[PDB]
């Protein structure tokens, strides 16, 4: 097929937060049928990044998810030509991030260009703070919607000094051509900073993601 077994990654991320700009250059690889990748990211302006760098991690490809035969998969069936997506990430206490990402490929390497941001955290919250440890596993509802597919996430970070802290991700995901587009069902999310410098300079990203009903 058009999406070999393995594929690499390349991207990169523009963005602000609470006015803060940053970019950051990523490079990876990763098995889009078995729905699992790895991504090595740099900090190449803004450093050191002021925020918490796990409110960046679920913006750094639905290509990369284990889609069974019986469901459409949206995201392989739209290479060669790509597709975007579009995300709001709502905080429980008023923080809100919006992203984009333009998808692409050559030859068996994915291209993204992203770009994010985020607005309104309060200065003693735990995104400025950096009190957050890591995403609880999440289950993301995929349903179509205006003729393409939307995913909804309830989704939540661990924080440091126990607790949760909670954020809802509304996606809207656009095939750049007609695909066949699938009935209502989820996708099982789990990702990880592996490793990472002290400033989260240099992070190494890990996320399994699998489709069923």
């Given at each position: 097929?058009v ?34 990748q ?5 900090v ?12 960046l991690?679920p913006?750094?490809?639905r ?10 998969d ?5 290479f060669?030509?790509?597709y ?19 998808i692409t ?5 994915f ?14 919250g ?9 995403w ?5 509802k ?5 003729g393409?597919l ?19 991700f ?15 069902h989820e ?13 989260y300079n ?12």
């Amino acid at each position: 097929s058009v999406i070999k077994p393995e594929m690499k990654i390349k991207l990169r991320m523009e963005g602000a937060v609470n006015g803060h700009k940053f970019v950051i250059e990523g490079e990876g690889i990763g098995k889009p049928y078995e729905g699992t990748q790895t991504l090595d990211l740099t900090v190449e302006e803004g450093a050191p990044l002021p925020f918490s760098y796990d409110i960046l991690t679920p913006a750094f490809n639905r290509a990369f998810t284990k889609y069974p035969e019986d469901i459409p998969d949206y995201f392989k069936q739209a290479f060669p030509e790509g597709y975007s997506w579009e995300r709001s990430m709502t905080y429980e206490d008023q923080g809100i991030c919006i992203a984009t990402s333009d998808i692409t490929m050559e030859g068996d390497c994915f291209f993204y260009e992203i770009r994010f941001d985020g607005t309104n955290f309060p200065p003693n919250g735990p995104v400025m703070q950096k009190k957050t440890l890591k995403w609880e596993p999440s289950t993301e509802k995929m349903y179509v919607e205006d003729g393409v597919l939307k995913g909804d996430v309830e989704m939540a970070l661990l924080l440091e000094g126990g607790g949760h802290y909670r954020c809802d991700f509304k996606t809207t995901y656009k095939a750049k051509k007609d695909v066949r587009l699938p009935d209502a069902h989820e996708v099982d999310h789990r990702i990880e900073i592996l490793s990472h410098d002290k400033d989260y300079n240099k992070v190494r990203l890990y996320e399994h993601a699998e489709a069923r009903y």
